[PDB]
Subunit: 87 residues, 2 copies
């Protein structure tokens, strides 16, 4: 099982833990990046209200405008996950 490394976050500690949990569940269920991303996005829309956006990959870079306290960029093993609400 996979090592969580949080790279950048503007998010409550409890929500960061839910993000890691959600992504862990997603990787258990799915192997294709877009399917992993959709699972996480949908779960966060449910738990923490719409509207979330999720990117899953390895090496991608990003520049997004996020809502205060609704942003995380982290790795689970070698898989990078960006999850945020837009500002």
């Amino acid at each position: 099982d996979r090592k969580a490394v949080i790279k950048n976050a503007d998010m409550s500690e409890e929500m960061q833990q839910d993000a890691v949990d959600c992504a862990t569940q997603a990787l258990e269920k799915y192997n294709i990046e877009k399917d992993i991303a959709a699972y996480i996005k949908k779960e966060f829309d449910k738990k923490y209200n719409p509207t979330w956006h999720c990117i899953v990959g390895r090496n991608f870079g990003s520049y997004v405008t996020h809502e205060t306290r609704h942003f995380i960029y982290f790795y689970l093993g070698q898989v990078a996950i960006l999850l945020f609400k837009s500002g």
Copy 2:
């Protein structure tokens, strides 16, 4: 120079061309993914109003909620670019 392949788009033809042009300029200037993404995002905020978000990589997958007519996912060579406004 790089071959443009548009994978998915919900965007005017003129705006798609500007996206390809912007990304071409970005790749001429910068080598690091997050810097490429920031250039494109900033140019689209200027030309087509805030608020855009941009991901640059190779193999990433995504699931985002986009504003009608403000979404493109395309490749320039092997570089994948996602550019959208949130719905």
